[PDB]
Amino acid sequence: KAVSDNDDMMILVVDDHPINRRLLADQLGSLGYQCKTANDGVDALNVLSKNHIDIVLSDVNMPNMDGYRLTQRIRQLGLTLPVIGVTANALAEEKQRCLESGMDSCLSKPVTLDVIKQTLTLYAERVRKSRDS
Structure with missing residues (x-):
């Protein structure tokens, strides 16, 4: 005689652009996932x-x-989860990921609803494998 909702998929949405942050969190909301909003690279891990x-x-x-x-x-800190670095013209974004060695993947700033959907779906299955057993 109750509900036990928890959202399940807690996603971290970080952006250095207020307009992009808004839309990225908006997209996540319509996906139906918990949207944790942040504003910095360090803020993500914080x-x-x-x-x-x-x-x-x-x-x-x-x-x-x-x-x-x-x-x-x-x-x-010790990443036990995928760090998807969304990037836009950081000279060599992939190279930064390799140097600091703490990411997982690299994307582009214009993450649309559809793009977000396939990435979230693919990674949802991935974390299911990475967390289970």
């Missing part, structure tokens, strides 16, 4: 340290500081 998250999506378009090191800090 939020991860405060609360548990399944999928990390940190979008950085500013190649002035991060889009790089934050993934170092994540590997320093």
Whole structure:
């Protein structure tokens, strides 16, 4: 005689752009997943340290500081989950991921609903395998 909803899929939405953050969280909301909003590369792992998250999506378009090191800090914390680094023109975003060695994948700033859907679906199955057994 009750409900035991928990959302199940707690996703981390980080963006360095307010307009992109809005739309990224909006898309996640219509997906039906918990949207944890953040604003920085370091904020991603900070939020991860405060609360548990399944999928990390940190979008950085500013190649002035991060889009790089934050993934170092994540590997320093000890990533047991996929860090998807959404990036836009950070010179060599993939190279930053390799250097700091704490990501998982790299995407582009314009993450649309459809793009988000296939990525979330694919990664939902992946984390199901990474967490179970």
